[PDB]
Design a protein around this ligand. Structure first.
Ligand SMILES: Cc1ncc(C[n+]2csc(CCOP(=O)(O)OP(=O)(O)O)c2C)c(N)n1
Ligand SMILES: Cc1ncc(C[n+]2csc(CCOP(=O)(O)OP(=O)(O)O)c2C)c(N)n1
Ligand code: SF4
Ligand code: SF4
Ligand SMILES: [Mg+2]
Ligand SMILES: [Mg+2]
Lengths: 627, 301, 627, 301
């Protein structure tokens, strides 16, 4: 099974919490979830919406359609009706509300709504939306939310304004009812979420009222859960991976959607540790909220100099500000990880939306030549293992490492098996660290592999400088020292490229003549698209780059030789990952499926885009669905 | 290889500051291996490189020494972290980080090389040069008002604010010692001739004008009880604006009653002083020692 | 003729001024010059040196050898003896000075000197250098500078410390003497440089003493100068071009070697203007010294919003700090030029040396996708015309334009014919500017070519925002507006790529099977290398890219088809210009000649590097000569 | 297209500031086409977009409004340039540019939306929130000392320093008018409730505490002669620290005797006021009008 549920409502009404409760109930019944959060750059009043994919099997991607849309306002109907396939739950009070009276709605969206309705001769009221939907076989279930709220207020002998938010749980209880799962899971999910008896009980009544007013349509059965499951978002998973990887200093400046990572680290900063002779100790991660990103990068780089594993996290505007600091870290061969939560850009761009438009900037960030190791996670499990990897790469190659996690992954959450992130050893490789044998240590010894022996502040006299320098860290302009030291640093990347197996830099799935060349978050939608297409004769393979620098040049040349279709799928305009392949190997993608609107690429967008390329060879498919 | 040419102009005030800072570190008896001098970009910024002792130097980015220093000190608070910045570096491009240090009260000393100019880029006006002043390096009179580093530091608020003079080495040395021992963020604004650029604010100009607050009977800049704090602060502010014929030097304000950033971290991380980030054992034979079991358990279905 | 003169001495002794006087004399005699300035990141005491190439024809490049080395200290002998071919002028007082007693000398250079001497069994004194040089047929002319200075002090009845700097003019007068040009040109050059009678007269005596103590060796004749000649450095020429191009606001933060550009603009900021009906008006360029580069970029971008032509100038560290601001300018479609004086990097790097290591960063600066138009000048005349071009490109495509001028060009100076920068019209194209017809103007109208009609602040109500926006400039997250607006901005680059002839984006010289693929400052050395090689049977052509974005993809594919040797010559480690060709076309250079030591690539380095590739196909030639 | 949803939380103090700023601009009679409101990033930063009048808005980068404003005003000084920044924006990331404006004394007004928090990123402590304060948005007490925007502005030194309150609209309106007319750089620090985050410094909390310096007999913050300047400045400083039960609002300091940056430019560019960059004619039929003849002549051999 694969059922797509969505609810929506004005930011500030706790609808996100309602979505969480719904999901938590369905999950306890033994269904996997993949959920999303879509908000405006706004604290109150704009339209927010929450999509939850439900299945008995692991889910990997979102969908373009909604099976069940749950609503209690006019706006959520207007915003999603064109995607709604099977069931609308709505508020009968707004039947005569016309799209022009929804003031929180962007004018552009009001126009898109009017266009979709006018096109088939409908007017602009909710009632007209209902007809639009009945023409497509959608079943609509209208609630007098006002009467139900009056009833509950009455029962609990409070005024209506006290129980106004029960509207949310009526919409949720009716949705959950359609599924046919037993009420207790929802009742339990309500009791574990709200913190006071009155709120529990009146929300429980609200959900009962919804559940008992609708028929059991999807007839879902329960599954016993064999292996232990967890539910986590991207932010959180990066934090877990970093902590597992030994992080003990993080400096950050708040920015969406990066801040949540640091807030989680800080709330959990006192960690249990099993140390020498099996002693339980606690060890604190110092977390500093810097005053700006220039302070944040440089604080982390300074911390690394003491031998601590350090990192920061940011997004486009912040990352641009960090360029200088990253260059200094390159010059001074300082391990640091920068988690790049890549979002809708340029400038402020879409602070609450996603993108893949900053890859080549990351690959070339800051002045000078130095090794910028760059990886990108494609799904939630990869995020965990990639954060451990980043930290090991940084210390092994003594250089900044950029770990890209798109916003789409950061804020989405999924249910998966716990063992996927606990089943293997948490390896910490500290690289070429040594105990100095005197008071003065030459920090930048010139070796054949480029990697100089490393010591920490406090162990011996060492020198770092932004200027070109000799083996002692003293300012040196001499041409021959310059030649050697500048090469030594860049040789580290060649050593990395010999040491890291190319097979760890890509995930390859399938073996077929049509290649889906991607990186990052489209991985999921692509794999789900490949399965659907396979059932229909259409054979495809996925090549997903994980490490862009050092680039898996030879492996890529081998896998792509003699392929007739190489279709780059990315959330940017210039297909920057394809551009990097072309720089490194000479191989040009044949076609593109691109999306720059900020919303996740869906399974169906990939399926249809590929059909559109096989059927008529169009060069660039441009996607735009969502929100 | 082994020699470092001390490349400052003969007669630069930077020689006095270097001499004074070395001596402060020696006389305090601090193990030099544990001292980190974090310096900015400019003539000023070269100072760790020229140090006699086995101190460490971290020569940073223009205006960014304080941010580096913060990461260094908070990761390993057993290091004695001293920051040497130029006036352009520290108070021009680094202004934001200069002020935010005051809010944190990290245990660091900040020594500003106040020559009135950008020495290293051929003597453009620094943020301490007064409006209308025309050094030999300026084609036209300075179009900018000066900022008073001591007044900005007080408003920020640094918990130890002092001014020294590079040509009174013994005095400067003793100020640096007190700035180092002070429990919190300390500023020493050091008046420092640049003979190459700035033929106004010379050695002879200052010799003639500087007087010690130490020689002012009853001048007491030390806050000992909370109720003293406001009066001590306003007395510091007033004094910090004395300029023409008389220029005060010495300690303007000291309040060791404000918790340090390290004291505030200890509230959230109870063993920070005993098991700070840099002391922590993060692996045993290449296997992480960090437990994330409970973190993962909290996310169970 | 081609004679290479060099003098050197401790920074702070006015040796730069001495070099200027020498050159100015030779020039008035009708010889062209190409000169250089090499200093340490240092105000006093480090070793500085000044190379001046002398010829009856225009000169394009520096050389690896020195014909005449003029010296008055030990250090200048030790620093240049291995390059000295025909004549050393030196101070007999230091004959017994050993390299270890030169304290201003970097230890690495002391080792290079000892190695070169030990290698043929010489010790480490100046006297040993003299033998080294006599083994190579060099003639040495030793002066008792102390006696000559005593003589002059005596003549003028002052103490010796008053006339100590006459040492410089003895070295200069002896050098100029060897050439055989008449003393009056030098006498005139001394009188026009020094500002007081006593200094004039004792420097004139110092130069006489030098001139009359040496034989006329090179027997140079005078040339009548037909067409008017000028002598200018790179900095200055960029300033001239900008002013000619209409610049009226520049904000900057001091950094080497960019500051001199702004200092010149400011010293000349009140410009004559021939305005409407042939009226003489003066118009001031506002020049602001910002507090940091973040202020500098954003000040200039704000200024552009008023309709002023605005720019900044910077180098690597500063440019890294500007990333964010450049991204905001991309998003808001703001014309601005950023002159990127590219220097020795990463971090502080080599603040007084050169490099080409930041090209791909420039091409990808800041988060998001937007048109970054990027050009790079290859010689001094190109700098002028390229600065006019940058400013027109910025207003025509409403986007940031990056004009790269390496340090090598910025600080070098040359004599050339004035008409090369006055002979054609100074064209100012303002792009799609209009008069608004009401109180409210939609700044970002979506058109087919991507370029929205532009109005200035004060003419009508307009809105700019860092966020994604609609046609009115108001914050808009709508997916379909986003799709359109994000594409519109990037479509401007495709329009640029259709509108700018590809032939204006490259200079091609010759037609041969061996290609020298370059950009920027190696142009000169390459052209001089091609002429020498041609005389010896070896046929080469130069392909010099001027505009990297939009890249001349089709032209490059055409010119390079069927070429058997494509040799990239660049001052970086990764041959970033070659990497860009490879990204855009699939064409890989066959071989490389690279230099990352900070000093200009010389004519001979190119000649020998190419011989070394033809004779033994080595993949990467690594250069390191100078300083 | 035509509507802009004013998307602030119902009851946000930003409604008061907007209302007050609109009214100030109207009542001064300034042509709206000539008014540019330059704003930062945050809830505060959205303000030009919500304006009723045909003013222009330039919504910038986080902490960079002052730098944009400077370029705008100096290129076209006939524009009336007003800057609206958040406290995090203006005093956190923008701190350096905030201080350097004071040295230039450009004729601009800067209005700081002082809510104590970063509204738009879900209510992290701003640089104005006191150490130990715990709003509903903070998991732990604020680890940072506050900076006093008025004291930093005075030390910087802004030539007009005032504090307003968003819930006394008439008063705020009159302060904004005076900040706009003031010849030089003016600060209005505006106390502004954020009901969503910051349940401490609410409307009722302030109503109870604010008093007007305007109602203080003989309070005169206007410098009329140079010799008054120091006393007026120190009286401003003292007052700027009054906080607990009593909170002063009004003008702390005003000195129109200091030349503006525009006055200093006029010394080097004598016709700047009549032929400023944005008014200049740089081409006639696509041919440059700038003569560089003399520049080139100076380089002749
Ligand atoms: C981001 C950046 N911009 C500009 C520079 C160039 N720069 C180096 S030192 C300096 C000024 C030094 O003045 P100050 O800090 O007063 O130190 P001083 O030389 O006078 O001791 C400048 C502008 C740089 N290194 N980095
Ligand atoms: C360089 C950069 N870093 C971070 C951000 C994210 N950001 C946007 S608004 C904001 C804080 C807003 O607080 P304040 O300036 O106090 O305005 P308010 O929302 O409270 O009015 C932050 C951290 C950004 N846009 N740019
Ligand atoms: S320039 Fe001024 S500051 Fe720099 S070294 Fe010479 S004298 Fe000292
Ligand atoms: S969050 Fe605080 S500041 Fe932002 S709008 Fe809501 S109330 Fe106003
Ligand atoms: Mg200085
Ligand atoms: Mg705020």
């Amino acid at each position: 099974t694969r059922i797509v549920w969505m609810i929506g409502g004005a930011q500030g009404l706790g609808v996100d919490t309602s979505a969480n409760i719904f999901g938590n109930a369905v999950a306890k019944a033994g269904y996997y979830l993949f959920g999303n959060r879509e908000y405006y750059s706004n604290i109150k009043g704009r339209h927010s919406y929450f999509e939850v994919v439900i299945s008995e099997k692991p889910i990997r991607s979102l969908s373009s359609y909604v099976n069940i849309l749950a609503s209690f306002d006019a706006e959520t109907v207007f915003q999603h009706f064109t995607e709604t396939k099977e069931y609308l739950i709505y508020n009968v009070e707004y039947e005569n509300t016309t799209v022009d009276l929804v003031k929180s709605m962007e004018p552009e969206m009001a126009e898109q709504v009017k266009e979709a309705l006018s096109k088939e001769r409908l007017g602009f009221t909710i009632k007209d939306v209902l007809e639009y939907l009945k023409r497509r076989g959608v079943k609509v279930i209208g609630f007098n939310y006002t009467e139900l709220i009056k009833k509950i207020a009455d029962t609990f002998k409070v005024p209506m304004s006290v129980v106004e938010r029960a509207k949310n749980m009526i919409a949720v209880g009716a949705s959950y009812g359609l599924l046919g799962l037993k009420f207790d899971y929802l009742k339990d999910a309500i009791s574990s979420t709200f913190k006071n008896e009155l709120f529990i009980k009146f929300n429980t009544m609200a959900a009962e009222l919804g559940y008992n007013s609708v028929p059991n349509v999807y007839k879902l059965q329960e599954y016993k859960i064999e292996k232990q499951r967890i539910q986590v978002d991207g932010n959180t998973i990066s934090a877990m991976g970093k902590l597992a990887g030994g992080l003990r200093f993080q400096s950050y400046y708040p920015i969406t959607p990066a801040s949540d990572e640091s807030v989680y680290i800080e709330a959990n900063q006192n960690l249990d540790m099993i140390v020498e002779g099996n002693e339980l100790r606690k060890g604190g991660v110092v977390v500093v909220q810097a005053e700006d990103e220039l302070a944040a990068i440089n604080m982390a780089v300074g911390a690394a100099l003491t031998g601590v594993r350090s990192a920061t996290a940011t997004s486009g505007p912040g990352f641009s500000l960090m360029s200088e600091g990253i260059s200094w870290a390159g010059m001074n061969e300082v391990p640091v990880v920068i988690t790049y939560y890549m979002r809708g850009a340029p400038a402020t761009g879409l602070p609450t939306r996603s993108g893949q438009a900053d890859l080549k900037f990351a690959l070339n960030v800051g002045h000078g030549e130095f090794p910028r190791i760059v990886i990108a996670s494609g799904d939630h499990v990869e995020i965990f293992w990639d954060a451990i990897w980043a930290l090991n790469l940084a210390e092994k190659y003594q250089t900044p490492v950029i770990h890209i996690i798109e916003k789409t992954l950061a804020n989405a959450y999924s249910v998966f098996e716990e063992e996927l992130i606990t089943n293997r050893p948490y390896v910490i490789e500290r690289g070429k660290i040594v105990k100095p044998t005197s008071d003065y240590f030459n920090r930048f010894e010139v070796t054949e592999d480029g990697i100089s022996p490393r010591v920490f502040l406090g162990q011996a006299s060492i020198f770092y400088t932004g200027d070109e320098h000799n083996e002692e860290g003293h300012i040196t302009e001499n041409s021959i020292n310059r030649m050697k030291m500048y090469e030594k640093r860049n040789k580290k990347l060649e050593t990395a490229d010999k040491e890291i197996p190319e097979e760890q830099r890509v995930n390859i799935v399938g073996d077929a003549d049509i290649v889906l060349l991607t990186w990052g978050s489209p991985k999921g939608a692509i794999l789900d698209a490949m399965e659907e297409l396979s059932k229909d004769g259409i054979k495809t393979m996925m090549v997903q780059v994980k490490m862009f620098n050092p680039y898996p040049k030879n492996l890529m040349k081998k896998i792509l030789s003699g392929k007739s279709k190489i279709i780059a799928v990315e959330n940017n305009y210039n297909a920057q990952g394809a551009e990097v392949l072309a720089e490194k190997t000479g191989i040009f993608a044949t076609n593109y499926i691109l999306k720059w609107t900020g919303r996740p690429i869906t399974r169906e967008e990939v399926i249809e885009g590929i059909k559109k390329i096989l059927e008529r060879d169009e060069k660039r498919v441009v996607l735009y669905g969502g929100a | 290889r082994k020699p470092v040419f001390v490349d400052w102009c003969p007669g630069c005030g930077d020689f006095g500051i270097l001499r004074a800072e070395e001596m402060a570190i020696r006389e305090l008896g601090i193990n030099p291996k544990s001292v980190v001098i974090v310096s900015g970009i400019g003539c000023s910024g070269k100072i760790p490189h020229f140090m006699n002792l086995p101190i460490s130097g971290v020569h940073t980015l223009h205006g960014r020494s304080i941010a580096f220093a913060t990461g260094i000190k908070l990761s390993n608070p057993s290091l004695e972290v001293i920051v040497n910045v130029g006036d352009g570096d520290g108070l021009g491009i680094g202004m934001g980080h200069f002020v935010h240090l005051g809010r944190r009260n990290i245990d660091i000393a900040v020594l500003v090389h106040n020559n009135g100019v950008y020495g290293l880029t051929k003597g453009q006006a620094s943020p301490t040069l007064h409006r209308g002043e025309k050094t030999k390096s300026l084609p036209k009179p300075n179009i900018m008002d000066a900022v008073n580093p001591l007044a900005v530091a007080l408003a920020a608020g640094y918990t130890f604010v002092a001014r020294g003079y590079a040509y009174d080495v013994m005095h400067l040395k003793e100020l640096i010692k007190k700035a180092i021992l002070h429990k919190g963020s300390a500023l020493v604004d050091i008046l420092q001739p640049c003979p190459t650029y700035n033929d106004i604010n010379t050695k002879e100009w200052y010799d003639k004008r500087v007087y010690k607050l130490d020689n002012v009977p009853g001048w007491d800049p030390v806050v000992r009880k909370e109720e003293e704090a406001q009066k001590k602060f306003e007395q510091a502010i007033m004094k910090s604006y004395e300029w023409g014929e008389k220029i005060p030097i010495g300690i303007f304000y000291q309040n060791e009653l404000v918790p340090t950033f390290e004291d505030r971290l200890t509230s959230n991380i109870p063993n920070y002083r005993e098991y700070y980030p840099a002391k922590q054992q993060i692996e045993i034979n290449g296997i992480s020692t960090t437990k994330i079991d409970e973190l993962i358990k909290a996310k169970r279905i």
